[PDB]
Every structure is written in structure tokens, then in C-alpha cells.
Design a protein around this ligand. Structure first.
Ligand SMILES: Cc1nnc(C(=O)NC(C)(C)c2nc(C(=O)NCc3ccc(F)cc3)c(O)c(=O)n2C)o1
Ligand SMILES: [Mg+2]
Ligand SMILES: [Mg+2]
Length: 201
């Protein structure tokens, strides 16, 4: 994708804001992030992985029934279920000592009215994210980057072989892999600013 002027300006401006905040007070340990990816399996079928994670590991994921997509109502329900997982797996959040900072992309179901309401009610801080920026999304440049290489060697048979493969694959990564993916953010933000909003190396 060739970025246009509007897109590069939004990327640079978003990265400046995040980087300057980071420099005043790091917030990276409070980020919960997530994204969707298709995973394919032959009987020409596919299932959507929806996953959320932080520097400690995977919090919650869903594998959708073959062919089914995330819409506004599904995403709202996912966020509610994710919050239940976060309470159970992240004590700093159950106790309200620590506000969730949520990083997701601008997919329409992510910004629909009902979802925006639900995020306000959960009262997670929603981080700015520019369009066409998977290079700035940890799920894309870290998690799915690693996962995609391993996936390419699989030939899944069933929706439940996928679920087991993901359970094992997620659990086999050490805490340090998750930590690195999140703490790569500031170096990425810096590169984007130095690129003036272009894609970078
Ligand atoms: C804008 C815009 N339009 N297409 C895109 C885009 O970024 N596409 C590509 C396939 C780069 C992409 N996309 C998403 C993603 O979620 N796409 C749905 C979405 C739609 C609109 C919107 F504003 C943001 C996101 C990924 O997660 C991802 O990894 N990639 C690689 O960005
Ligand atoms: Mg996405
Ligand atoms: Mg993505």
C-alpha cells in the first residue's frame, strides 16, 4: 500500500503524541492489545482468530465458526468476555489499581456506537491508532508475524485442531516474547516519526 498524504500525517502525528507521552511516563505495562486474523483449513474454509494480549501473555481469544465475521454485536460481547478474563488473570486490574489502556485498530466494528459505549462503560483508555498501520500494532508486527511462519507449516483438518494448535503455541512462548512485543512500541513510534509517517525498515 502506498500511503497518501493524509495517512502519513495521521501516522506521524499519532506516533509523536504516543512517544511524548511515553517519555513523560511509560504506560506500556498497562496496554492490552488485540486484533483479528483468518486461519485457513480444508474440508476452502477459514476461521477468524480474535485475540487479546499484554506483556504477560494471551488474556483471551475466540476462534469464530467457519466463515463467520466480527460485527458490532459480536465485538461488544467479546470486549465484555475479555474483561471477565482480565479480572481473573490480571489482579492489578481486578483491584482497580490500574486502568486498562486498550490498543486496537480502526476496523468499523471496533468504532461502532455500541462498542464505543461499551469501552466507555468498561472505562478503558482507548489509544489512538492510525489507519493502515499494522507496523504500529503489536498483534501484527509481533504476534501474528511469529504465528504466521508456524501456521504456514500446518494443514488443519478441523476447527478444533486449530484451537489446540493455538493453545499450545500461545503457551509455549515465554513471558519474555510477549514482553518484547509490547516494549518494541517506542522504537517503532520513533522510526515512524523519523520516516515522517512513511513505512519504515
Ligand atoms: C484503514 C484500512 N483499510 N484497510 C486497512 C488495512 O490496514 N488493511 C491491511 C490488510 C493492511 C490490514 N488490515 C487490518 C485490518 O484490521 N483491516 C480492517 C480495517 C479497515 C479499516 C480501517 F480503518 C482499519 C482496519 C489488519 O489487522 C492487518 O493486519 N492488515 C495487515 O486499513
Ligand atoms: Mg485488524
Ligand atoms: Mg492485523
Amino acid at each position: 500500500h502506498e500511503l497518501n498524504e493524509r495517512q502519513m500525517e495521521r501516522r506521524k502525528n499519532t506516533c509523536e503524541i504516543l512517544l511524548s507521552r511515553y517519555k513523560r511516563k511509560s504506560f506500556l505495562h498497562r496496554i492490552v492489545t488485540g486484533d483479528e486474523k483468518w486461519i485457513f483449513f480444508v474440508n476452502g474454509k477459514k476461521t477468524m482468530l480474535c485475540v487479546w494480549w499484554d506483556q504477560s501473555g494471551v488474556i483471551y481469544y475466540e476462534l469464530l465458526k467457519p466463515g463467520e465475521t466480527v460485527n458490532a454485536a459480536r465485538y461488544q460481547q467479546q470486549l465484555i468476555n475479555l474483561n471477565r478474563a482480565l479480572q481473573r488473570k490480571r489482579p492489578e486490574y481486578q483491584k482497580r489499581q490500574h486502568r486498562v489502556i486498550f490498543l486496537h485498530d480502526n476496523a468499523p466494528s471496533h468504532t461502532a456506537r455500541a462498542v464505543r459505549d461499551t469501552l466507555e462503560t468498561l472505562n478503558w483508555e482507548v489509544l489512538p491508532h492510525a489507519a493502515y498501520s499494522p507496523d504500529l500494532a503489536p498483534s501484527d508486527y509481533h504476534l501474528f508475524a511469529s504465528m504466521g511462519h508456524a501456521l504456514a507449516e500446518q494443514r488443519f483438518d478441523s476447527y478444533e485442531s486449530v484451537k489446540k494448535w493455538l493453545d499450545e503455541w500461545f503457551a509455549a512462548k515465554d513471558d519474555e516474547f510477549y514482553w518484547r512485543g509490547i516494549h518494541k512500541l517506542p522504537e517503532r513510534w520513533e522510526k515512524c516519526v523519523a520516516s515522517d509517517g512513511k513505512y519504515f525498515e
